[PDB]
């Protein structure tokens, strides 16, 4: 996201506004304003690692744009928007992750290697890999009889089409000591 | 395996009547060990389960997305609104005796995946069989009737 | 694939309850929470059965023979 001093009004605010957001949702509900529309409207930019060295990115827009003149104990402890020199804003921090780790629910609540292991296991998994599986003549194939979408999903999984082609079932699990088996 | 690097095989399969149960009549599909949690620190597995219970009870699709404003204290408030002990525990009764277990079990839905290694595709035994031409020693592999 | 006949956990028949669940959502404009409950899917084991089901058969049917 591009952040400029731009509008005389207030502080340094994000180029993209609630207007563009609904303008996009009009095209989303349609199934004219595309990703290319944000790019040519110069509200969004492409930044490599070499360019990243010259910018200053805010994590969240709202939690990183106004300034101070109660707080939930349950919530995690966040930093600050003290920088008045914000050039860009992150679209969403969860976009640091790739396909595999995007299926992990609450990975911010796990020890880092445990996530690396689940990144490797989702490949050793099973479910519908394609709907044309009956028509294909693969060397090997496994289809889970009754796949279920997950009860807890990531906003990212929508794009991964996970809810349409799942890889597991919602088991009723008891974390108990029973027979010792 | 759960989506938290928590892999494991089956040990035993028990029918509904041998299994522990909620007074509600609900019985587990899976019984995972309490021990598989402290060393590992897969807190998200626990949260998955808490949220998933709420989701099933409420007819929702729980948001397990990473950098959210969702808290365990939040989810808990909803679960107690649904009539359950906020932190997911449930009083359970032993299947053989019908007596209440002194313990309260963390019972709730959790997304488990069926992994590609089935025991009957791995099991192998040999007592004399094919030998290599050159070395005159046993061949390699389950397929090849190896030693 | 297609709506399982009966709940895995308790064995309550959820085989009939599919078309009826979908009509409660579409035509009655009900939410999933009240829909499941109207069909009398009381425990969460039964709720997860219908609530979380993916009816892929509908996609498969779309292919020719």
């Amino acid at each position: 996201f591009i952040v400029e001093d731009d509008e005389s009004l207030g502080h340094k605010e994000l180029k993209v506004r609630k207007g563009h957001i609904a303008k996009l949702m009009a095209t989303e509900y349609q199934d004219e304003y595309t990703w290319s529309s944000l790019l040519n409207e110069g509200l969004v930019e492409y930044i490599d690692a070499e360019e990243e060295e010259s910018i200053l990115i805010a994590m969240q827009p709202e939690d990183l744009e106004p300034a101070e003149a109660d707080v939930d104990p349950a919530k995690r402890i966040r930093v600050s928007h003290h920088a008045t020199t914000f050039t860009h804003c992150e679209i969403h921090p969860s976009m640091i992750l790739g396909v595999a780790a995007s299926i992990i629910p609450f990975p911010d609540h796990n020890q880092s290697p445990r996530n690396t292991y689940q990144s490797a296991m989702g490949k050793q998994a099973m479910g519908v890999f394609l709907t044309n599986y009956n028509v294909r003549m693969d060397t090997m194939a496994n289809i889970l009889y009754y796949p279920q979408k997950p009860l807890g999903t990531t906003r990212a999984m929508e794009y991964l089409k996970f809810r349409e082609l799942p890889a597991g079932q919602n088991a009723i699990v008891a974390i108990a000591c029973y027979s010792g088996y | 395996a759960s989506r938290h690097g928590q892999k494991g095989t089956i040990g035993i399969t028990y029918r509904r009547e041998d299994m522990p149960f909620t007074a509600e009549g609900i019985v587990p599909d899976l019984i995972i060990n309490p021990h598989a949690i402290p060393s590992r620190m897969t807190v998200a597995h626990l949260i998955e389960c808490l949220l998933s219970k709420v989701a099933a009870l409420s007819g929702n699709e729980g948001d397990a997305s990473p950098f959210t404003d969702i808290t365990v204290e939040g989810i808990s408030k909803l679960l107690r609104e649904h009539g359950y002990q906020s932190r997911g525990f449930e009083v359970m009764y032993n299947g053989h005796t019908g007596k209440k277990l002194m313990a309260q079990i963390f019972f709730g839905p959790t997304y488990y995946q069926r992994l590609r290694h089935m025991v009957d595709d791995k099991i192998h035994a040999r007592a004399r069989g094919p030998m290599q031409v050159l070395t005159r020693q046993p061949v390699e592999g389950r397929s090849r009737d190896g030693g | 694939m297609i709506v399982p006949v009966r709940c895995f956990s308790c064995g309550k028949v959820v085989g009939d309850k599919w078309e009826s669940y979908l009509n409660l959502l579409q035509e009655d404009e009900l939410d999933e929470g009240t829909a499941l409950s109207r069909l009398g899917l009381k425990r969460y084991c039964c709720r997860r059965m219908i609530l979380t089901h993916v009816d892929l058969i509908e996609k498969f049917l779309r292919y020719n023979p």
Binding site: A26 | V54, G62 | -
Partner: peptide, 15 residues
């Protein structure tokens, strides 16, 4: 707490 998909009903009743 959960993921809101009823945005078809919300965007239809608002637009």
């Amino acid at each position: 707490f959960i993921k809101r998909d009823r945005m078809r009903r919300n965007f239809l009743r608002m637009r």
